[PDB]
């Protein structure tokens, strides 16, 4: 005869009240629910927790299941699980601020995260298109990184503790991103006898590249065997863009300061699962290898993703 | 002036023609390389190696772009690496055949993955979306699981080694199946006041739930608070379906055959990371631990996911 009045969201916006005994559990009565962060779905209602909020992550509303799919976009059935989860978990890292850089400090293999947010915090003009990744960016740019730091994981299907790979993770996360100017990028692909074609992409899938870490490298002539039996050839003919990310596998390369390189930030693969970021400032190369920073003008290391200004190229 | 010809594929099926010179690497001249399961990009091209098929995993074409946003789907641009990877590392893996049944032999903490696969082997009349996963999955129908085992992975971002959860996997892969005949399922939600509002759910969206793991529960009444002041209710009103798979967090249920329950199989976990997955068959539970069968009529174990037949229901 004992109930208490729980409140229910999936989004801190929207809230159900449903009635609840002090005879079963939170699973039995109403379904997988959070509390303050932790899972209380194998708990029995306490008077106490009247008037309460809950997150709910199962037996969803119609309602609820339209607001998630809005919030978050389509989501496997575990996502709400995993993000509460993570987001309990990631608690206790830490953001360091070191001369006025945010960087993660290292806690449970956490270190590839410390270059994807990193990298992420020099991309200007970047909306994100899930609303659930647009907020948590913005809490991330005020000083609370633990949202944005979960559904990142979550997103990318990262286990609490486990390494990963930094550029994976990168480009997971900008396939879920919008550039708010706009960029061009056109590949042209031709042979003398057969014809020219013509290939545009638009948005920030012209300011990423995977297999070239190099502006030479990826405005470099293409050749290969055509149809006819000459040659067929692909270069890269047009790229306006407001900044430029170009990524590859782990590979050695003496950077230098010297030189003065265009970029402006790269990241670092060290060996099992090791991940460092390098920024150029002042003449000198920041790595910043989770939370610790280390000054240099001269480098040899394992490149992965190498960050460059804005491209105005016509060939 | 020495040149190999060397013939590029993303997919087995259309080749490109690259003429190779022997004086620099793979990933220079042309990206990312595997040659017979090995990544041989940092390998200069010898002489020995004109004539044979190389899986390009970057750089590609805009013809090779296209045959591989229609074999795999939209894919990250990690995904051709990984899979080739994956693929490699997977390769020494055993399937073993108890009695008729296929199961995953244990290694590399892989005993997720059984009960992935083992619980898809019981899916009547479902086909893959996505053609590289529907050829898979007929080659591990006919007894080579490779592809499938790394394709799995690839998609669920699994790392070699790595421990994993069964359900998340499951459904993950069930969001790219589709189903060969048809399924229904109406949920009502009502006030006596408000009015009626039914939803439908077609396919193999109506033959898996997650937040309940019994035919009961599912067909249970939920009742919460209505805009109103009354009560609202959300019941299962009408169901129709080849199968029927319910998910859930671990949950002791006492198993037993002695009531012969309408369900078919389950997934069971325990504890870490360890997965055992049961069948009902001939009034026993036969207990399939990765390659290694235990028959029992009881059993209290920490039940995920249920697998019922075909169903028959209006309400
Ligand atoms: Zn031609
Ligand atoms: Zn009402």
């Known amino acids: 005869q004992l109930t208490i009045e729980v409140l229910v969201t999936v989004d801190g916006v929207n809230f159900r009240t449903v009635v609840l005994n002090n005879k079963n559990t939170y699973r039995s009565q109403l379904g997988c629910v959070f509390f303050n962060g932790a899972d209380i779905s194998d708990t029995i209602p306490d008077e106490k927790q009247n008037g309460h909020s809950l997150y709910l992550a199962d037996n969803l509303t119609a309602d609820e299941t339209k607001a998630l799919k809005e919030l978050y976009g389509p989501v496997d059935p575990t996502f709400l ?74 997103y990318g299907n990262c286990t609490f503790g486990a390494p990963d790979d930094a550029s994976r993770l990168l480009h997971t996360v900008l396939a879920k991103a919008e550039l708010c100017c706009s960029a061009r990028m056109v590949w042209r692909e031709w042979c003398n006898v057969c014809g020219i074609k013509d290939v545009v992409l638009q948005g920030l899938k012209a300011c990423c590249y995977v297999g070239v870490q190099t502006v030479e490298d990826l405005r470099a002539r293409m050749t290969y065997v055509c149809q006819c039996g000459g040659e067929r050839h692909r270069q890269l003919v047009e790229h ?76």
């Open 240 to 315: 306006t863009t407001p900044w430029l990310l170009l990524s590859g596998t782990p590979n050695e390369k003496l950077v230098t300061t010297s030189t003065a390189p265009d970029f402006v930030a790269f990241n670092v693969f060290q060996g099992v699962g090791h991940y460092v970021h390098a920024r150029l400032k002042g003449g000198l190369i920041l790595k910043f290898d989770s939370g610790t920073v280390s000054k240099t003008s001269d480098w040899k290391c394992k490149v992965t993703d190498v960050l460059f200004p804005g491209q105005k190229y016509s060939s």
């Open 81 to 154: 699980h995993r993000f509460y989860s993570l987001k309990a978990a990631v608690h206790g890292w830490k953001m360091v601020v070191c001369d006025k850089v945010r960087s993660l400090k290292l806690s449970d293999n956490n270190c590839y995260l410390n270059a994807v947010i990193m990298t992420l915090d020099l991309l200007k003009d970047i909306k994100f298109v899930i609303p659930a990744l647009q907020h948590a960016f913005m809490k991330h740019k005020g000083g609370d990184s633990t949202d944005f730091i979960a559904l990142i994981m979550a």
